[PDB]
Protein backbone atom coordinates (compact mmCIF):
# COMPACT_ATOMS: atom_id res chain seq x y z
CA UNK A 1 0.00 0.00 0.00
CA UNK A 2 1.57 3.27 -1.19
CA UNK A 3 0.73 6.51 0.58
CA UNK A 4 1.41 10.24 0.44
CA UNK A 5 1.54 11.67 3.99
CA UNK A 6 -0.08 15.05 4.60
CA UNK A 7 2.20 17.85 5.89
CA UNK A 8 2.21 17.16 9.66
CA UNK A 9 2.68 13.41 9.28
CA UNK A 10 5.39 14.06 6.68
CA UNK A 11 7.16 16.40 9.12
CA UNK A 12 7.17 13.72 11.84
CA UNK A 13 8.51 11.06 9.44
CA UNK A 14 11.30 13.33 8.22
CA UNK A 15 12.19 14.24 11.82
CA UNK A 16 13.40 10.64 12.31
CA UNK A 17 15.37 10.56 9.05
CA UNK A 18 12.93 9.94 6.18
CA UNK A 19 13.76 11.84 2.97
CA UNK A 20 10.93 11.16 0.55
CA UNK A 21 7.27 12.02 -0.08
CA UNK A 22 5.79 8.59 -0.90
CA UNK A 23 5.93 5.62 1.49
CA UNK A 24 4.67 2.12 2.04
CA UNK A 25 2.43 1.66 5.06
CA UNK A 26 5.19 -0.57 6.49
CA UNK A 27 7.54 2.44 6.30
CA UNK A 28 5.01 4.80 7.86
CA UNK A 29 4.55 2.44 10.81
CA UNK A 30 8.30 1.92 11.12
CA UNK A 31 9.08 5.63 11.26
CA UNK A 32 6.20 6.36 13.63
CA UNK A 33 7.65 3.69 15.94
CA UNK A 34 11.05 5.36 15.76
CA UNK A 35 9.38 8.66 16.56
CA UNK A 36 7.45 7.27 19.55
CA UNK A 37 10.52 5.59 21.00
CA UNK A 38 12.98 8.45 20.45
CA UNK A 39 10.51 10.90 22.02
CA UNK A 40 10.04 8.46 24.95
CA UNK A 41 6.27 8.70 24.62
CA UNK A 42 5.37 5.24 25.91
CA UNK A 43 4.78 4.81 29.66
CA UNK A 44 7.84 3.02 31.12
CA UNK A 45 5.57 1.09 33.54
CA UNK A 46 2.64 0.52 31.15
CA UNK A 47 4.48 0.16 27.91
CA UNK A 48 1.59 -0.42 25.54
CA UNK A 49 0.27 3.09 26.32
CA UNK A 50 1.53 6.15 24.47
CA UNK A 51 1.11 9.62 26.03
CA UNK A 52 1.18 12.35 23.41
CA UNK A 53 -0.64 15.46 24.67
CA UNK A 54 2.69 17.30 24.94
CA UNK A 55 3.76 16.28 21.44
CA UNK A 56 2.88 16.96 17.79
CA UNK A 57 1.81 13.30 17.59
CA UNK A 58 -1.17 14.22 19.80
CA UNK A 59 -2.07 17.01 17.37
CA UNK A 60 -1.72 14.55 14.49
CA UNK A 61 -3.82 11.80 16.08
CA UNK A 62 -6.25 14.09 17.94
CA UNK A 63 -5.89 12.20 21.21
CA UNK A 64 -3.89 12.68 24.42
CA UNK A 65 -3.05 8.97 24.66
CA UNK A 66 -3.67 5.67 22.95
CA UNK A 67 -2.86 1.97 23.28
CA UNK A 68 -0.95 -0.13 20.73
CA UNK A 69 -3.56 -2.84 21.39
CA UNK A 70 -6.07 -0.64 19.50
CA UNK A 71 -5.02 -1.39 15.91
CA UNK A 72 -8.18 -0.27 14.12
CA UNK A 73 -8.24 3.03 16.02
CA UNK A 74 -4.57 3.67 15.19
CA UNK A 75 -5.06 2.88 11.49
CA UNK A 76 -7.94 5.37 11.40
CA UNK A 77 -5.78 8.09 12.97
CA UNK A 78 -2.98 7.40 10.48
CA UNK A 79 -5.21 7.18 7.38
CA UNK A 80 -6.75 10.56 8.28
CA UNK A 81 -3.26 11.98 7.80
CA UNK A 82 -2.40 10.68 4.35
CA UNK A 83 -3.73 9.86 0.90
CA UNK A 84 -3.48 6.28 -0.31
CA UNK A 85 -2.42 6.13 -3.96
CA UNK A 86 -2.49 2.34 -4.45
Amino acid sequence: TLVRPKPLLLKLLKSVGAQKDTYTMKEVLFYLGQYIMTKRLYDEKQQHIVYCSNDLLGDLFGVPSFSVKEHRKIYTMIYRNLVVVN
Binding site: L29, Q34, I36, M37, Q47, H48, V50, V68
Partner: peptide, 14 residues
Protein backbone atom coordinates in the same frame (compact mmCIF):
# COMPACT_ATOMS: atom_id res chain seq x y z
CA UNK B 1 3.31 -4.54 14.33
CA UNK B 2 1.68 -7.61 15.89
CA UNK B 3 2.91 -8.16 19.50
CA UNK B 4 0.94 -5.46 21.44
CA UNK B 5 2.36 -6.17 24.85
CA UNK B 6 4.56 -3.04 24.64
CA UNK B 7 5.59 -0.37 22.17
CA UNK B 8 9.14 -1.88 21.81
CA UNK B 9 7.74 -5.37 21.22
CA UNK B 10 5.21 -4.10 18.70
CA UNK B 11 7.98 -2.53 16.63
CA UNK B 12 10.95 -4.88 17.15
CA UNK B 13 12.15 -6.41 13.88
CA UNK B 14 9.13 -4.98 12.07
Amino acid sequence: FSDSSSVPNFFRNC
